Amino acid sequence: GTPFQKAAALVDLAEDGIGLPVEILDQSSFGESARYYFIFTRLDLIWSLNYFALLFLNFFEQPLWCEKNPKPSCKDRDYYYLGELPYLTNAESIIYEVITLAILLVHTFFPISYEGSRIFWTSRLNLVKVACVVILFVDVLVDFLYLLPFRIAPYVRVIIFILSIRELRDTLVLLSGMLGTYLNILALWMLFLLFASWIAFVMFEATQQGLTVFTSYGATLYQMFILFTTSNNPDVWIPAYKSSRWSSVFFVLYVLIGVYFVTNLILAVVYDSFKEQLAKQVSGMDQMKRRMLEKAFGLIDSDKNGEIDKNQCIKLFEQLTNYRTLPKISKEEFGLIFDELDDTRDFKINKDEFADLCQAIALRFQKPSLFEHFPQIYHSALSQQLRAFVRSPNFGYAISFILIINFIAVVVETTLAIEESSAQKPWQVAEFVFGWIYVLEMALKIYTYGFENYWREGANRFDFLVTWVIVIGETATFITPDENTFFSNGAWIRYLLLARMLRLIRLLMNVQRYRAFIATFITLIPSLMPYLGTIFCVLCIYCSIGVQVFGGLVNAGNKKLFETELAEDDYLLFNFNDYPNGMVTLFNLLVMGNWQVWMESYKDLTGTWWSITYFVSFYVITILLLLNLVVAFVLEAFFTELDLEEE
């Protein structure tokens, strides 16, 4: 047991909670565990692809109501308002499930090799993983034997995907703590709805608005709930306004208080409670991080001198460079990290000074040209003029001028979109020239800045990709002037025109005051993914429930469907017949635009009032809790960055 290997393992554990068990580093036969751990970590791309394949299977499964015998077979894609995604047959679904299940089974039960026996079977996460895998295997076996109330696999495989990502696991734990305070503010919100309905039920008792809308307290409470979202504001109290113009005062007060006071109060409480959960998690994670780093320091210094020498600190680096979960470190970066690590400036790292290792590792990002091989070409009299001009401030001025000319060429080309293909070639030739100029621009930039220096920053790598993607398509259209099924097609021409448009957005980066706002938007999406992924997983669960409950009520032969608001508004294509169909239907309810049409219509098709619990719970869980959390993220991101420049 080499102490440096254990120190590297402890550093890997300190970077994030994922790693080797703590109690096996000093245990005998540790290398046999490290080897299997490295082998397991070499296949993380395969594991992630398998998990995404399991997640994306719900989109391609035949709906459960098709497993029965409807009067027309559901291959009639127009009768049920289905569309555009194929269904997997029995053989295809069976083989896909078998392959994915085998890979998942290998992934789940492999940690037992480097975790021993008792440690694997005493972890709650491993226990729930094994339980989910066993449930999925039993479901697959039952399905194979049949070829049953309902198919439970869709829910299970979504759960497996959620717990397979560390960020998705963390979000659910945080939401668990919020559940106490969130339920508290829902009771206050519920009391406001309950009493406001009581006032409106007795006020409009014998009036015209109580004989058609507020027929009973349940009807009143139902209508006052929708009014709280301002989805039917003028519609609901037309009869009250037609019989008395003073009745509008009550509804004006209710909407104003409901929207500005109550709705904003929920957002403030949700964000405040969630922000408290970060403090508990971050402090706990950081406290664990420093404990692991401190323990690693003790292993390295067996002499108890208190500090590590230069070579000993270096020897740690090549031991921790075998891990793929740690930032890449070069050979010359070894001194760079040690130079930056030293805070007391004594050629030695201290115990409390060593606790800033993980932050130090991924902070260097610096440092030399391959065009310096021949000094008779690069160092020329005319070369300096080119070198001066490319680095001159007018270089951007010239490129901006070219972009403006390109902008003029694009807008005039889009104007002649109804003309035939006879006059499109002259503009194609002009666009052909514009493609190579930008390639010439980026190639010239490589000649001056170098190759490796040109590739260091991540933003330029995106510019490298988009420049090459658009030029190969542009030149492919020109080198093939005869008729083709891939270059003269209407779809290909449209894609070409869009590509040049997304090139023109670069002009918007010239405005510094606008460029800052775009940069904030770009840097926010990576940090918003775990919360956006949770919303996607919640939609997946709700989509599976919607298909199983509201399966085939929207047909071309239903009689009660054409009397509902769904048919009158021509929303028949937004149903819960498919998984893709229900995935975009839940997006329409996500934005709360005409959202009560589906809630009203599916209540009539099911014929029961219990069906509205599907939509009420979706609004409460997703709109009020998850979307309000995402909204609060965008505000806090802008508020901190905006105030930063004035400081």
For position 195 contacting a copy of itself by CB under 8 A, the verdict is yes
Question: Given the complex with a copy of itself, which of 130 and 262 has the nearer CB atom?
Answer: 262
From its phi and psi, is residue 28 left (phi > 0), alpha (psi between -120 and 50) or beta? beta
List 84, 332, 419, 420, residue binding a copy of itself (CB under 8 A): 84
For position 78 contacting a copy of itself by CB under 8 A, the verdict is no
Place of tokens 């190639």: 443
Q: Applying CB under 8 A, which part among 167-175, 227-235, 432-440, 616-624 lies near a copy of itself? A: 227-235
For position 208 contacting a copy of itself by CB under 8 A, the verdict is no
Question: Given the complex with a copy of itself, which of 145 and 505 has the nearer CB atom?
Answer: 505
* Shortest distance (Å) from residue 435 CB to a copy of itself: 19
Question: Given the complex with a copy of itself, which of 285 and 591 has the nearer CB atom?
Answer: 591
Place of tokens 């402890």: 10
Burial grade of 149 (CB within 10 A; 0-12, 13-18, 19 or more): exposed
DSSP code for 350:
E
For position 56 contacting a copy of itself by CB under 8 A, the verdict is no
CA atoms of 370 and 562, how far apart (whole Å): 71
Annotate each residue in 251-270 with x if it binds a copy of itself (CB under 8 A) or - if it does not, as one string: -x--x---xxx--xx-xxx-
The listed partner (Ca ion, a copy of itself, none) that binds 400, CB under 5 to 8 Å by sort, is none
* Shortest distance (Å) from residue 619 CB to a copy of itself: 15
Site for a copy of itself in 458-517 (CB under 8 A): 490, 494, 497-498, 501, 505, 508, 513-514, 517
Task: Give the torsion sign (CA, 255, 257, 262, 267).
Answer: positive
The listed partner (a copy of itself, Ca ion, none) that binds 344, CB under 5 to 8 Å by sort, is Ca ion
Question: Given the complex with a copy of itself, which of 261 and 365 has the nearer CB atom?
Answer: 261
Site for a copy of itself in 408-447 (CB under 8 A): 414, 417
Question: Given the complex with a copy of itself, which of 123 and 400 has the nearer CB atom?
Answer: 400
Annotate each residue in 334-363 with x if it binds Ca ion (CB under 5 A) or - if it does not, as one string: ----------x-x-x-x-------------
* Shortest distance (Å) from residue 497 CB to a copy of itself: 6
Residue type, 89: T
Q: Applying CB under 8 A, which part among 20-28, 134-142, 479-487, 635-643 lies near a copy of itself? A: 635-643
List 179, 194, 429, 634, residue binding a copy of itself (CB under 8 A): 634
CA atoms of 67 and 147, how far apart (whole Å): 11
Site for a copy of itself in 569-628 (CB under 8 A): 569-571, 573-574, 580, 584, 587-588, 591-594
What is the number of alpha carbons within 13 Å of residue 203 lying toward its C-beta? Answer: 18
Task: Give the torsion sign (CA, 380, 385, 386, 387).
Answer: positive
Q: Within its chain, how far is the Cα of 97 from the centroid? A: 25
Place of tokens 């991924």: 362
Task: Give the torsion sign (CA, 305, 307, 310, 314).
Answer: positive
Site for a copy of itself in 132-171 (CB under 8 A): none
CA atoms of 327 and 12, how far apart (whole Å): 10
CA atoms of 184 and 178, how far apart (whole Å): 10
Per-residue tokens: 392: 């001159």
* Shortest distance (Å) from residue 560 CB to a copy of itself: 21
* Shortest distance (Å) from residue 117 CB to Ca ion: 23
Phi, psi of 14 (to 5 degrees): -70, -35
DSSP code for 24:
G
H or E element that contains 580: helix 579-590
Site for Ca ion in 168-227 (CB under 5 A): none
* Shortest distance (Å) from residue 53 CB to Ca ion: 24
Per-residue tokens: 370: 């391959």
For position 350 contacting a copy of itself by CB under 8 A, the verdict is no
* Shortest distance (Å) from residue 553 CB to Ca ion: 49
* Strands, E assignment, 179-229: none
The listed partner (Ca ion, a copy of itself, none) that binds 402, CB under 5 to 8 Å by sort, is none
Question: Given the complex with Ca ion, which of 236 and 313 has the nearer CB atom?
Answer: 313
For position 643 contacting a copy of itself by CB under 8 A, the verdict is yes
Is residue 83 within 8 Å of residue 57, measured between CB atoms?
Answer: no
Nearest to 99, CA basis, from 54, 135, 143, 129: 54
Is residue 59 within 8 Å of residue 579, measured between CB atoms?
Answer: yes
CA atoms of 146 and 572, how far apart (whole Å): 34
For position 568 contacting a copy of itself by CB under 8 A, the verdict is no
The listed partner (Ca ion, a copy of itself, none) that binds 135, CB under 5 to 8 Å by sort, is none
List 7, 10, 12, 133, residue binding Ca ion (CB under 5 A): 12
The listed partner (a copy of itself, Ca ion, none) that binds 475, CB under 5 to 8 Å by sort, is none
Q: Contacts for 461-470 with beta carbons within 8 Å, 24 or more apart?
A: 466/502, 466/503, 467/438, 467/439, 467/442, 468/439, 469/499, 470/435, 470/499, 470/500, 470/503
Binding site for Ca ion (CB under 5 A): 12, 15-16, 18-19, 301, 303, 305, 308, 325, 344, 346, 348, 350
